[PDB]
Structures are given as structure tokens and as C-alpha cells.
Amino acid sequence: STGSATTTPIDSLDDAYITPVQIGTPAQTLNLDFDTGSSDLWVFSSETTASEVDGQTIYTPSKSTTAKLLSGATWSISYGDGSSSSGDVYTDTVSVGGLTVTGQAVESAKKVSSSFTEDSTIDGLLGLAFSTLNTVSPTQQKTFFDNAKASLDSPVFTADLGYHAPGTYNFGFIDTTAYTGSITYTAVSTKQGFWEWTSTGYAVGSGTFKSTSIDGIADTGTTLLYLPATVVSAYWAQVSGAKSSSSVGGYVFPCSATLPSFTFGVGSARIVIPGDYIDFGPISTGSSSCFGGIQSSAGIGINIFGDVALKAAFVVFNGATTPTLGFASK
């Protein structure tokens, strides 16, 4: 089997991407944030504290003839940005782009943090990291991809995120018309539960490529590109007037600037992020100071190849017995 679904930016800055997902019988379609950095499929629901729902579409398990409460199961997750959610668990039928999994764990939120409430466009998350990170207790549950992968034509999914435009998540096949050149594959460590890999280096604009190992994670659920402070300082030094602002929480730059590209290495291959992918717009409405899309990872503990990086590539998440990642230009 295969599936193919369009993913759409939630706003004009590409702050996140949402993908429609059918849950239950009859189908209830929710728009979920596909997140290769986590491993829970959780949704706003009829069980979510009413004051914490503000415009989201909810899953109502009592209206699904295939929903079954997973007895005794609870979940609770906290994300790297400080947001969180928790609740109980159903199993139900879940379909993405024509690919159907029966008995998928659907984690129904009883509580969500304010950042989720305040984002009316995101109805939940669909985790695509390794199932070892799933938070369901006392019996850990499998991700949608883990449940589907034996049925797929090939045990892979691909992320093709757009810049200020829709893109595609495919399951089970590699669309050879969706990229240019070849796909370069690179080794993955699953020891932390992530799609963790080592970039071979970087360049700023037309500058010389610096060969240096940068261990990080491919994370579709993180907006920005978080890299070591040395790398980030080298990038922003090429933008007149850019500075790290402690009050804002990262590098900012004059909105009148023209940003240089940023290149990262995948083996001997090179992925070029155009400068305008690095512009996240005014820090507050009407400001002429703009927020940068490349930020230091120093306070995180891990480097993160988030959407800023991934949207410059066609990315293969190869879930073979030994997982690998692939990157192509597009």
C-alpha cells in the first residue's frame, strides 16, 4: 500500500504545517502537525477541557463506531518549546492520504497548554519519530508509520515541505519526479529515539564550505534551524545589523536586509537553503526588526534540522531494519 497527503503552512511564515487525517467511522477529519521529532498521535477531543479549546476541530470518540477505549492507558507529553498536553487513549481507524491503519492509538487530550489553545489551526500532532519515545503508559503504543510499515510497498515515508506553499507527505514510495539529481543517504542513530544524523558541514552564502561534523535531528515539528553557536554566529555576521537579542530570545536582523543562503552537507552532497527561507518577519507587529530562522542550539542540548532546513530538500525517512535518512535538492 501507499498514501499521499498534501501538507499546508498554517500561516504566511510557515510556522508549522498541517496535514488532513481521517479518524474513526464515519471519518472525522482533523488537521494534524506531522512531527518527526515525537512519537504520539494526539488530538483535541470532546474530552478536552472546554476553556482550552478555541477553534480547533475535535475528535469525538463516542461518534466513531470503531473507537475503543484503551483501558487504563494515559499519556502526557512536554515538548522542547515548553508546551504540553495529556489525556486518555482510544484505538481507532486512522487514514492518511488513502493509507489506512486499524487499531491505531489515538491519544485524546483532556488538557493542553496555552500555546496549543491559542493556535486554532492545529488539531493535534502525528508523531513520526521512533516508537520508543511514545508516552502512553503503562503500555507504550506504536506510531502510525510503525503500524503501517509492514503493509507499505517500501518501509519509507517522505517529507516535501513547501516554502510559502503546500507540499506533500508520502508513505510507502519515493516520487522520483519530486526532486532533482540524486538522493544522498546518510546514517541514522536511533539511540535517542530521533532521526538523528551527522551533517558534514556548512557554508554561508557564496563562502567556502567548512567541513565539520554536526550531529542533529531531522524534525518536521520544529520551525527553525538550530545549530551550534559558532555556526550561527558565522551566518549572522554576514547580515549587516544582525545581533543576538537576549530580550527577544535569539538573532534578529533589520527587515530591510537581504539574507544570504545557508548550505548544509549531506555526505558529499549539498543542500542550499535560500536566504528568504531564513526570514521569519517582524518580531512584533509593525516592527522593522525581524526574527532569524537560524538560531543557536546552545540552550537545547541537540542540534535541530527543522522546517527551515527540511523545506529546502526532498527528505526520505527510511524505516528499514537499519534506518537511514535521504536528502535531495528539489
Curated annotation (Swiss-Prot):
What does the record list as GO biological process? proteolysis
What is the catalytic activity of this protein? Hydrolysis of proteins with specificity similar to that of pepsin A, prefers hydrophobic residues at P1 and P1', but does not cleave 14-Ala-|-Leu-15 in the B chain of insulin or Z-Glu-Tyr. Clots milk
Q: Where are the transmembrane segments?
A: none
Q: Where is the active site?
A: 35, 199
Domain Peptidase A1, residue spans = 17-328
Q: Please give the name of this protein.
A: Endothiapepsin
Q: Which UniProt keywords apply?
A: Aspartyl protease, Disulfide bond, Hydrolase, Protease, Signal, Zymogen
Q: What is its EC number?
A: 3.4.23.22
Q: Which residues of the full protein are shown?
A: 90 to 419 of 419
Q: What class of enzyme is it?
A: hydrolase
